[PDB]
Design a protein around this ligand. Structure first.
Ligand SMILES: NC(=O)C1=CN([C@@H]2O[C@H](COP(=O)(O)OP(=O)(O)OC[C@H]3O[C@@H](n4cnc5c(N)ncnc54)[C@H](OP(=O)(O)O)[C@@H]3O)[C@@H](O)[C@H]2O)C=CC1
Ligand SMILES: NC(=O)C1=CN([C@@H]2O[C@H](COP(=O)(O)OP(=O)(O)OC[C@H]3O[C@@H](n4cnc5c(N)ncnc54)[C@H](OP(=O)(O)O)[C@@H]3O)[C@@H](O)[C@H]2O)C=CC1
Length: 747
């Protein structure tokens, strides 16, 4: 039994194949000319009144969402469509092409945006297996990509694709690896450093002495959970960073050891700052250079923050002394530092002009007017054009080389100029050479010093909680996959901040909650957690709770292995009851993990499915997972159990597979946003259940009493007879052969 991962290789679409009849199922006009019917019904009408079955109907899906209701509407809608379609049967040899936007993660940079659409994928996948060569799934992030590609989409016979500008992608299961990604020393307190600089291959995770022991000064030791990656980190990795640097500066985590020389904050504390050599389970730094963590921030959203905002602050306050009314020019706007400055600048009451690449513009919250491409030098006369020089009072430049020159001709009036880039660094007096009026400082944030950083840290937080700065968009990765992340980073595909997360680790002190801890899997996992693993505080949770056979025994067993076990009756889909449960977890064993193993089953081809059945199967998986993530503390690890059925589209379980595909998508999106989430797509288990096991046993016991099972027809004729019949107590049974075992059975 392998573990599998679903990949999306590029495929080649046949470029010379015949373009086919097409109708559009949609609200509105088509820029192109192709038949449009607002709904399936109307396309029937045309068929009714003579029209010839189109080879392909396109059904672009209305935008979903990641909320229960969303999932509900957009699978229900998919069902009406699938059912309407199957029942016509003039629409045979014709194919329904359902289009989605962002239901599917294909490229490294990109997360699932529409969970509900991802549910759609599962359901339809099921139906595809039920009816081959009749439906086609297409994820296309911006439509009209579609039509050009359309004769190819159809000729390749492939039922599932995602269109990206890169290419067309098909999905397939793959073994883990394939190289096996990044391997860990397991001996805790390693780190990521570039071993063979020059190339991203030859990154590795090798044990680090420095982190482990001992403190300190001065110093405080941290159990890291996430860390920010900076552009710096990507150059270091490529033997292309002009200066001294150790991979990974900044992060957030939990305090382990403190002292000597430290009083302000103490162990257990959640903390973020500018840690050196950040990319490991264990690192240690100066307690003034780090600070405790605001709102209910995730460790991930904490880790993105420090470097970018310290720079922005240290740069715009200390070095620039930016005043209200004064205006600013910032490069790499949709980047972290670029992103940060514009936020802080708007607080400091400046006008702002800035630059990123055209594809990132939407992510800037700046009036069209003030924007410009960042890999050209056009901005100059457009901005100087935009405002008569004097142009900008201050410049926070990252673009070095010759892009840095067109910069300084902004702000001719005079003013201050800040350089970030070490390659082609300059001289202040020799800068005064080129332009009059302009002072010039080339800085590193660490320059401010521990004293100043801690003071800027305390001052930034204030702003964050004042709701005046908001942490950047996070796109997260697991340290073991850093190469994929740094490649992204160095290719400048991203917006906002990238972040690395450390391998998840449950507080051995803490509580673990298993939903559906009665079920075939939940019990086993429940047992394995207590009997083999650390776990010594359990909450189990199922609709019936302790009242279902044999849950009393199930508990006994564990509590007997010396554990603090609670089994509460609770429907996970009732947020009000879940809350009641979580709250009753004791303060000293606070929960660190959820195993969402709760589930309800259905069976039937998509023809036969109904809305009411759909919701049956959705309620524990979707509402439950939503309730959980809503209620759960951010950095509680969440393990969702889906089913391989959601991935193969097992058929017979359309609607179940929808639920499971949601879970798969919820994790993929959620880990991306930084939070500790993992989703396992179980194939079949041998196990059975307390259930079940107990029903089976009853059957043995009754047999072992030389009894035999009654057919249902006979059982009901007896029901009939015994109900209205003279004897008040009556044993309708079928015996076997002609029992010295039972005294009652004599004569
Ligand atoms: N000295 C110090 O203390 C610090 C220095 N820095 C420096 O500031 C810069 C910004 O850092 P950070 O915000 O973390 O990283 P960013 O997220 O800002 O990434 C850099 C961005 O610059 C843009 N860019 C412009 N020209 C190019 C190019 N030719 N190739 C690739 N990208 C380009 C890219 O986006 P776009 O498509 O919009 O151009 C890219 O996203 C880094 O280079 C870093 O070295 C950062 C922090 C501290
Ligand atoms: N076992 C297998 O062969 C496979 C399992 N899986 C995955 O494993 C999971 C478990 O399968 P299995 O253990 O056999 O399922 P079971 O039906 O045997 O157990 C399901 C458990 O979930 C509980 N439950 C159902 N709905 C709720 C609810 N709304 N609130 C609280 N508890 C609820 C049920 O308790 P009660 O009804 O008493 O409330 C029961 O305890 C499945 O959901 C699926 O994700 C995937 C493929 C195959």
């Amino acid at each position: 039994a392998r573990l599998y991962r679903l990949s999306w290789p590029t495929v080649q679409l046949p470029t010379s194949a015949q373009p086919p009849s097409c109708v559009l199922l949609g609200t509105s006009e088509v820029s192109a000319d192709i038949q449009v019917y607002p709904d399936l019904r109307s396309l029937t009408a045309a068929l009714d009144a003579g029209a010839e079955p189109p080879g392909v109907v396109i059904a672009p899906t209305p935008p979903g969402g990641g909320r229960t209701a969303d999932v509900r509407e957009t699978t229900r809608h998919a069902l009406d469509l699938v059912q309407g379609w199957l029942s016509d049967q003039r629409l045979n040899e014709s194919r329904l092409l359902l289009v989605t936007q962002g239901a599917v993660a294909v490229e490294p940079g990109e997360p699932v945006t529409d969970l509900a659409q991802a549910a759609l994928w599962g359901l339809l996948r099921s139906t595809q297996t039920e009816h081959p060569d009749r439906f086609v799934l297409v994820d296309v992030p911006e439509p009209a990509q579609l039509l050009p590609a359309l004769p190819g989409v159809l000729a390749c016979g492939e039922p599932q694709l995602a269109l990206r500008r890169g290419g067309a992608h098909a999905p397939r299961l793959a073994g883990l690896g394939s190289d096996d990604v990044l391997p860990v020393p397991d001996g805790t307190g390693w780190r990521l450093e570039a071993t063979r600089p020059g190339s991203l291959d030859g990154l590795a995770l090798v044990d680090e002495p420095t982190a482990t022991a001992p403190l300190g000064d001065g110093e405080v030791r941290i159990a890291m959970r996430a860390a920010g990656v900076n552009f710096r980190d990507a150059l270091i990795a490529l033997g292309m960073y002009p200066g001294v640097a150790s991979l990974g500066s900044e992060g957030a985590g939990v305090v382990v050891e403190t002292g000597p020389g430290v009083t302000g904050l103490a162990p257990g504390d959640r903390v973020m700052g500018m840690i050196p050599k950040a990319f490991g389970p264990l690192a240690v730094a100066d307690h003034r250079m780090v600070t405790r963590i605001p709102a209910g921030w995730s460790f991930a959203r904490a880790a993105s923050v420090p470097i970018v905002f310290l720079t922005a602050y240290y740069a715009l306050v200390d070095l620039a002394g930016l005043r209200p009314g004064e205006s600013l020019l910032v490069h790499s706007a949709a980047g972290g530092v670029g992103m940060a400055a514009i936020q802080l600048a708007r607080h400091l009451g400046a006008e702002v002009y800035a630059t990123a690449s055209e594809d990132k513009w939407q992510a800037v919250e700046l009036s069209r007017e003030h924007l410009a491409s960042s890999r050209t030098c056009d901005f100059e006369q457009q901005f100087l054009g935009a405002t008569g020089g004097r142009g900008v009072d201050v410049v926070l430049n990252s673009l070095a080389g010759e892009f840095a020159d067109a910069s300084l001709r902004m702000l001719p009036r005079g003013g201050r100029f800040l350089e970030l880039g070490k390659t082609d660094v300059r001289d202040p007096v020799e800068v005064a050479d080129a332009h009059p009026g302009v002072s010039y400082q080339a800085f590193d944030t660490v320059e401010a010093g521990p004293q100043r950083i801690g003071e800027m840290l305390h001052e930034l937080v204030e702003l964050f909680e004042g709701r005046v700065l908001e942490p950047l968009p996070v796109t997260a990765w697991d340290v073991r996959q850093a190469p994929e992340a740094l490649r992204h980073l160095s290719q400048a595909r991203h917006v906002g901040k990238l972040v690395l997360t450390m391998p998840p680790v449950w507080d051995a002190a803490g509580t673990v909650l298993v939903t559906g801890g009665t079920g075939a899997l939940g019990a086993e996992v429940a047992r394995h957690l207590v009997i083999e693993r650390g776990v010594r505080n359990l909450v189990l949770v199922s609709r019936r709770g302790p009242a279902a056979s044999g849950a009393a025994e199930l508990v006994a067993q564990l509590t007997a292995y010396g554990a603090e076990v609670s089994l509460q009756a609770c429907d996970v889909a009732d947020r009000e009851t879940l809350a009641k449960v979580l709250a009753s977890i004791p303060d000293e064993h606070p929960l660190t993990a959820v195993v969402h193993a709760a589930g309800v089953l259905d069976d039937g081809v998509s023809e036969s499915l109904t809305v009411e059945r759909l919701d049956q199967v959705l309620r524990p998986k979707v509402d439950g997972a939503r309730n959980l993530l809503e209620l759960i503390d951010p950095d509680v690890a969440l393990v969702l159990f889906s089913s391989v059925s959601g991935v193969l589209g097992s058929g017979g379980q359309g609607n179940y597979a929808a639920a499971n595909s949601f879970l798969d998508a919820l994790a993929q999106q959620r880990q991306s946003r930084g939070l500790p989430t993992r989703s396992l797509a179980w194939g079949p288990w041998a196990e059975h259940g307390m259930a079940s096991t107990l029903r089976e046993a009853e059957q043995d016991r009754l047999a072992r009493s030389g009894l035999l099972p009654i057919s249902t027809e006979e059982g009901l004729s007896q029901f009939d007879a015994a109900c209205g019949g003279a004897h008040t107590v009556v044993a309708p049974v079928r015996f076997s052969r002609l029992a010295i075992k039972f005294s009652v059975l004599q004569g």
